Amino acid sequence: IAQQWIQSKREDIVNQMTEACLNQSLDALLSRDLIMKEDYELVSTKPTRTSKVRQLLDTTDIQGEEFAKVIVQKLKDNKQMGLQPYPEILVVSRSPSLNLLQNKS
């Protein structure tokens, strides 16, 4: 859901997130241990405001819903009205994804 949404409004998130929004999403990303210091410095070196958000979107390729929802959930605190239709946030309880069902014989 958020993995699809980040590819629907990719051109809106970069225009909505000025620069202070990126710094706040970055602190929140590291709180979930989803980004290593080795690549979290590569998003913080970018000398151009819009180019900062580019390296942030490059991590989303590996992350899927993680670096995606962080954007949708940051913009919620700033209530910019550009992206009111935000995606889901963690709706799984015990779906048939990892769960067992098979047995011997």
């Binding site: 958020a2 769960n99 098979q102």
Partner: protein, 94 residues
């Protein structure tokens, strides 16, 4: 249910969907299971890093499926959980 109770064919699908979605997936999971982001950075240099995390976690008592599915939520990667809930049905005779 425990992750050690799963059949070998299920564990293969989890490895395939990890390695076919990303290369840091297991690292994020490890961080929220009780490991550290900079500490896994040395673990990525191993010959079987994905298998070693699953093995070193399966030797613990918290190796339950309900906890594993919720541990993807911590990192914010419901994309792994939803991909597996939609990719449960795929096989052929060939």
């Amino acid at each position: 249910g425990l992750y050690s109770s799963l059949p070998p064919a299920k564990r293969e699908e989890v490895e395939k969907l990890l390695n076919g979605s990303a290369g840091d997936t297991w690292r994020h999971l490890a961080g929220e299971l009780g490991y550290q982001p900079e500490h896994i950075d040395s673990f990525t240099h191993e010959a079987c890093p994905v298998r070693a995390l699953l093995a070193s976690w399966a030797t613990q008592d918290s190796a339950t499926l309900d906890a594993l599915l919720a541990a993807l939520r911590r990192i914010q990667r419901a994309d792994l959980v939803e991909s597996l809930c939609s990719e449960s049905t795929a096989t052929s005779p060939v």
